[PDB]
Amino acid sequence: HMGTRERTLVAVKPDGVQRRLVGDVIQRFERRGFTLVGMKMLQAPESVLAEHYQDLRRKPFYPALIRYMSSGPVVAMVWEGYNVVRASRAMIGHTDSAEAAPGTIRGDFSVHISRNVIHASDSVEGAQREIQLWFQSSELVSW
Amino acid sequence: MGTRERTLVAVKPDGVQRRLVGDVIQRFERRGFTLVGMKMLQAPESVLAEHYQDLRRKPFYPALIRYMSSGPVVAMVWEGYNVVRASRAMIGHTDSAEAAPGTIRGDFSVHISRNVIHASDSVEGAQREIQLWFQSSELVSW
Amino acid sequence: MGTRERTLVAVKPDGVQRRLVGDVIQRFERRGFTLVGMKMLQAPESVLAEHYQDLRRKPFYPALIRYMSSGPVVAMVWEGYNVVRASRAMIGHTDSAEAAPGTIRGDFSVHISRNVIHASDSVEGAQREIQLWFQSSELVSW
Amino acid sequence: HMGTRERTLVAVKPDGVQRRLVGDVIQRFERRGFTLVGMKMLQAPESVLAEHYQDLRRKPFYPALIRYMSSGPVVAMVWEGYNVVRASRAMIGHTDSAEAAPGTIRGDFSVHISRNVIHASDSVEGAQREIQLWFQSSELVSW
Amino acid sequence: MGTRERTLVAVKPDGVQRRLVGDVIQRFERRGFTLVGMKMLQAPESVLAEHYQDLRRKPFYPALIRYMSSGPVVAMVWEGYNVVRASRAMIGHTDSAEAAPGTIRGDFSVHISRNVIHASDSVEGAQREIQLWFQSSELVSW
Amino acid sequence: HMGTRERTLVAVKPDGVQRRLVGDVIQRFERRGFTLVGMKMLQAPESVLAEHYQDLRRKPFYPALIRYMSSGPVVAMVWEGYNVVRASRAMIGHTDSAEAAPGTIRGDFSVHISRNVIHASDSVEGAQREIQLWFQSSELVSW
Numbered sequence: 088h089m090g091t092r093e094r095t096l097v098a099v100k101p102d103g104v105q106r107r108l109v110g111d112v113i114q115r116f117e118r119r120g121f122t123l124v125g126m127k128m129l130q131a132p133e134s135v136l137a138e139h140y141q142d143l144r145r146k147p148f149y150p151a152l153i154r155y156m157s158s159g160p161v162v163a164m165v166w167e168g169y170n171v172v173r174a175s176r177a178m179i180g181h182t183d184s185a186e187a188a189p190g191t192i193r194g195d196f197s198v199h200i201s202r203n204v205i206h207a208s209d210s211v212e213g214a215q216r217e218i219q220l221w222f223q224s225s226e227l228v229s230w
Numbered sequence: 231m232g233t234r235e236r237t238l239v240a241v242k243p244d245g246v247q248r249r250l251v252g253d254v255i256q257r258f259e260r261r262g263f264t265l266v267g268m269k270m271l272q273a274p275e276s277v278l279a280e281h282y283q284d285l286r287r288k289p290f291y292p293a294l295i296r297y298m299s300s301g302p303v304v305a306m307v308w309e310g311y312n313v314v315r316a317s318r319a320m321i322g323h324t325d326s327a328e329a330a331p332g333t334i335r336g337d338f339s340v341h342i343s344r345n346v347i348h349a350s351d352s353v354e355g356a357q358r359e360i361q362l363w364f365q366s367s368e369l370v371s372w
Numbered sequence: 373m374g375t376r377e378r379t380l381v382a383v384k385p386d387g388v389q390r391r392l393v394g395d396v397i398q399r400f401e402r403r404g405f406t407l408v409g410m411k412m413l414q415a416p417e418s419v420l421a422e423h424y425q426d427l428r429r430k431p432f433y434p435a436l437i438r439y440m441s442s443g444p445v446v447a448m449v450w451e452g453y454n455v456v457r458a459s460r461a462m463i464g465h466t467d468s469a470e471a472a473p474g475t476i477r478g479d480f481s482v483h484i485s486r487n488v489i490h491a492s493d494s495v496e497g498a499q500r501e502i503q504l505w506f507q508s509s510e511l512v513s514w
Numbered sequence: 515h516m517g518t519r520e521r522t523l524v525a526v527k528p529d530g531v532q533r534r535l536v537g538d539v540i541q542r543f544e545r546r547g548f549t550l551v552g553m554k555m556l557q558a559p560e561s562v563l564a565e566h567y568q569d570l571r572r573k574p575f576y577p578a579l580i581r582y583m584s585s586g587p588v589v590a591m592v593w594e595g596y597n598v599v600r601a602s603r604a605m606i607g608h609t610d611s612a613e614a615a616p617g618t619i620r621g622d623f624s625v626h627i628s629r630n631v632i633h634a635s636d637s638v639e640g641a642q643r644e645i646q647l648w649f650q651s652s653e654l655v656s657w
Numbered sequence: 658m659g660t661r662e663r664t665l666v667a668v669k670p671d672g673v674q675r676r677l678v679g680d681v682i683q684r685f686e687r688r689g690f691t692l693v694g695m696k697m698l699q700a701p702e703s704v705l706a707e708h709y710q711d712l713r714r715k716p717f718y719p720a721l722i723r724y725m726s727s728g729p730v731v732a733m734v735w736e737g738y739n740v741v742r743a744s745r746a747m748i749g750h751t752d753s754a755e756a757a758p759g760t761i762r763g764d765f766s767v768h769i770s771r772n773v774i775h776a777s778d779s780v781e782g783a784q785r786e787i788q789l790w791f792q793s794s795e796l797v798s799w
Numbered sequence: 800h801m802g803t804r805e806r807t808l809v810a811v812k813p814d815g816v817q818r819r820l821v822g823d824v825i826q827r828f829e830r831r832g833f834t835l836v837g838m839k840m841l842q843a844p845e846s847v848l849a850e851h852y853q854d855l856r857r858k859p860f861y862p863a864l865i866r867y868m869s870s871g872p873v874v875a876m877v878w879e880g881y882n883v884v885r886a887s888r889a890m891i892g893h894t895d896s897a898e899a900a901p902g903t904i905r906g907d908f909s910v911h912i913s914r915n916v917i918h919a920s921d922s923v924e925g926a927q928r929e930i931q932l933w934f935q936s937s938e939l940v941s942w
Contacts, residue, residue, distance in 0.1 A: 105372065106547070109265065110256025117249040119908055120818070126270040126304065130370050160370040162268065170897035170910050178901050185597035189605050190617025190902025196546055198597050228272050228302045248689070262482055311482050312469040320473050327739040331747050332474025332759025340689055340738050391544040398537025404767055407536065410589065412553040414655050444655045446553065453767050454754040462758050474759025512557050512587040514532065533832070612882035616890050617902025623831055625882050676829040683822025692821065695874065697838040699940050729940045731838065797842050797872040799817065
């Protein structure tokens with residue numbers, strides 16, 4: 088699970104699904120050569136969202152964030168490849184889409200903060216934690 | 231009920247290995263259809279056999295099951311007005327080589343065998359296929 | 373005079389709300405046509421009635437005027453060799469659901485009613501429509 | 515006319531129209547979620563151009579700039595949306611296209627300075643001034 | 658040998674001046690064909706005359722040679738299953754104006770004369786054309 | 800051979816050709832307005848590669864690099880235009896693709912170092928040297 092078999096969790100948020108950017112987002116990961124190892128669309132249960140965002144529980148927007156994230160379907164994915172965690176982090180852009188650079192996903196599609204289209208694990212460790220949280224081992228397919 | 235019509239679309243193992251999933255999904259998205267279900271999975275042979283029961287007594291059935299289980303497939307459920315027939319016209323001819331440019335097979339495939347994608351051929355076929363690949367709790371209506 | 377041929381193209385209210393203006397314009401641009409006039413406007417009913425006078429005695433005329441004035445439209449004048457017939461072939465069948473993939477309706481629309489775009493059906497129709505939506509001082513020849 | 519109803523003026527310059535980049539430019543504003551509120555193609559009158567570029571009147575290239583800008587049709591547009599002024603400014607890139615970053619509009623399409631394809635208001639205040647200058651209130655349509 | 662089939666594709670002078678080379682190559686690439694040879698060159702008249710020997714006794718031959726030598730062309734050799742007929746269907750009708758949208762001529766061209774691209778019309782024609790434009794040491798099989 | 804007639808050498812590496820990114824790469828140079836002045840696909844002879852990469856001969860990866868670069872076909876091109884050398888350099892991105900910015904060619908398509916899809920002359924002087932090395936004068940066509 089290192090080097091070339093490194094993995095990360097990527098999720099298209101409710102705004103991204105409703106604005107119909109799912110294909111657009113996947114093309115960017117595909118053209119970069121990553122391997123799609125797991126994928127599903129679902130309405131995330133608040134219990135999963137709470138653990139996902141557990142370290143923001145204190146923040147005052149935490150309650151609003153949880154409601155928003157469960158307000159519509161989400162598309163969860165697991166991508167595999169060399170440097171996939173840091174590369175995906177660079178592709179998405181700054182949390183604040185309005186400040187994100189053109190060329191990044193938030194920079195080309197969004198202008199909001201909570202509605203910033205996509206999520207990606209911020210570290211190898213966090214990716215291992217998030218992937219176990221959103222996926223059962225049986226849903227991951229290794230090529 | 232008209233605009234509640236649904237259909238099953240699946241990217242075959244070759245479409246996934248060739249990294250055409252985003253390309254495929256994008257075509258349905260810009261046409262205005264709603265994605266109500268989706269998942270990547272290694273298809274079990276019991277599902278393929280039921281999915282392809284009508285070809286069980288035709289030539290090359292074993293080659294067919296072999297291909298469809300040689301790697302993961304991405305199954306999707308799209309919803310929209312006249313979605314069954316429109317999805318049919320969009321994927322094009324079975325024989326990719328003679329599929330018209332502009333359709334998915336005409337733009338991305340060259341073979342009859344490995345033809346990248348599958349779409350239900352009728353409303354009743356769609357109802358059957360959807361129940362076959364998805365549980366009701368996997369479909370989200372938005 | 374051949375390569376001075378002109379036609380009227382208009383993105384309907386649904387095309388604008390769905391944000392397909394760039395997509396539409398891009399298809400005409402890469403085909404090599406010259407954009408000689410363009411503007412976004414909420415169409416006045418007097419203009420629509422004159423534009424659609426031939427449908428005044430057919431079913432659903434009121435539904436037609438209602439749709440076409442439910443939001444802004446983008447009217448354009450394109451110039452080029454055989455532009456009237458080429459623009460016609462590019463937008464595809466009136467019934468979007470049976471429009472061939474590759475045409476604008478076949479790629480972006482699913483309905484007969486809301487079919488995203490309009491293009492003059494003939495040279496004389498184009499001359500009429502252009503005079504209807506634009507003043508001569510709004511056309512720029514480059 | 516604040517927050518979510520913020521507006522800005524965007525213009526495709528003569529080079530952009532002749533090189534047939536109008537569709538390309540509009541797609542980028544559309545995919546980012548902005549709302550097209552006004553639009554027209556015209557040969558700008560030198561009187562409008564002089565006021566538009568009024569604070570460069572002293573510069574020695576000012577006379578050349580005015581001639582160039584009226585040498586061909588221009589497409590003027592008004593876009594509306596949250597943070598639309600700063601977001602549009604980031605999407606266009608550095609005045610000098612050759613130095614503009616890939617992903618920005620000047621960075622992907624141009625390599626010149628006066629022929630840098632596009633213009634966008636540099637501030638909320640300037641946008642209010644420019645929109646009144648290029649458009650009559652009756653040409654703007656609010657959704 | 659089936660998947661060893663080859664064909665000659667060439668972007669005409671207008672396709673190059675209009676900067677459509679990447680667009681053209683991209684369509685063949687996503688279809689899955691393999692590029693085994695390519696070069697940009699100002700075509701010698703002896704090559705054009707041999708390439709177009711069948712049109713030597715038809716109207717407008719001189720206008721044809723003039724156009725094809727008015728600027729550089731990009732010649733390519735693509736390899737793949739049924740590549741001759743598929744490349745034929747992808748470029749579309751000779752008369753660009755009536756070429757279906759989705760094909761290269763239908764999307765990028767409007768004239769019969771200047772129709773952007775050329776593709777061998779048959780397997781034997783392809784063998785002939787390839788030998789005409791390329792030396793064996795310029796073809797790389799990968 | 801200055802200003803507007805400036806030229807540079809661009810090459811699509813073996814990985815770029817096999818992953819079928821040739822069209823993608825050319826579209827980016829075309830849309831920016833450059834003029835394609837020379838082009839050919841070939842299996843570069845180790846003798847050409849050695850001179851191309853001559854100033855890395857001391858490095859320990861030099862031998863591996865030469866083998867890799869001759870392991871498959873390469874597409875060589877000469878592009879002409881104002882500021883074409885510096886503009887092409889900015890379009891390709893950082894040597895390490897994983898660190899390259901989204902929007903650059905390496906930033907959108909690669910995640911490796913030696914397999915970073917493309918090469919571009921790093922200076923006007925180097926471009927003159929590289930173009931003479933890969934092309935004979937008769938293969939270049941001026942419009």
